[PDB]
Design a protein around this ligand. Sequence first.
Ligand code: UDP
Ligand code: MN
Length: 277
Amino acid sequence: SEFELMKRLSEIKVLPILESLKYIKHNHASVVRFGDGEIDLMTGHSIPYQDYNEKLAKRLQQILQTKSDEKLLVCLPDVFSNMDRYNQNARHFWERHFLKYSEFYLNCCDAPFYGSTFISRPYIDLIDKSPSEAYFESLKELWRGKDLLIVEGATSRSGVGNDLFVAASSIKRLVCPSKNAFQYYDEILRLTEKNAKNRLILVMLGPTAKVLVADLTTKGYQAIDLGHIDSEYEWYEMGATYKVKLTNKHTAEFNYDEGIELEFSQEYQEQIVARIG
Ligand SMILES: O=c1ccn([C@@H]2O[C@H](COP(=O)(O)OP(=O)(O)O)[C@@H](O)[C@H]2O)c(=O)[nH]1
Ligand SMILES: [Mn+2]
């Protein structure tokens, strides 16, 4: 029975958002997050913004086997216990997901603990949004007073038009393709390294982000996979109750980057070190 698989899967232990953040800070750890799309890719499917690629799938599988330590926190969706935190559509989505991949989760995810993939998703799927302010405040402490290198796609525009990164000392951006970034992986890694001197690296780049963080970490850098944090922050700032489309940039869960009306932001443009693609 699926019910019995649900119970068995609750053996997986995830540190929820605030606990994950305490871990990252205490340890100055890199962070890689596995979401539903990564599992889809690893098992042979194409996902929003990234076509199936066998080399990518293999790297993702290797990275998932890495133990979490003071250098790197490996994260999973925080859905194996206390699912009642999430709204009905999210609960259904996630249970369907881990039931489909029960064999994957039961067999490949045997570490003593994982961080939360939802460090990038601190608002919209929660029934009780009261803790979200605290979540975002804790997140911001990661980059307060830091020089940042943000590696993201052309539509991501993380922090653009909002105050998410206002307390960062400086921002440089490596702007990559908004879809199929893995095709340019070697160049992305090469230019990230070149520009990372004395910077904290934040990556918003789908499955490619996980490989980048893994490789940067092996080279001794702290790099944090932050995914869709910008969409969540925008929804939080407007007090959104549902996933509303942003007009000026990519929006999480809108899976084709359609209908985007781009603006010219001099400040954003001046932050761009190079474009890849
Ligand atoms: O080839 C790609 C794949 C995705 N992204 C960006 O990656 C971010 C989302 O990353 P992820 O899937 O890790 O987000 P999560 O939902 O797990 O927070 C968004 O800004 C996308 O625009 C990108 O720019 N290029
Ligand atoms: Mn996602």
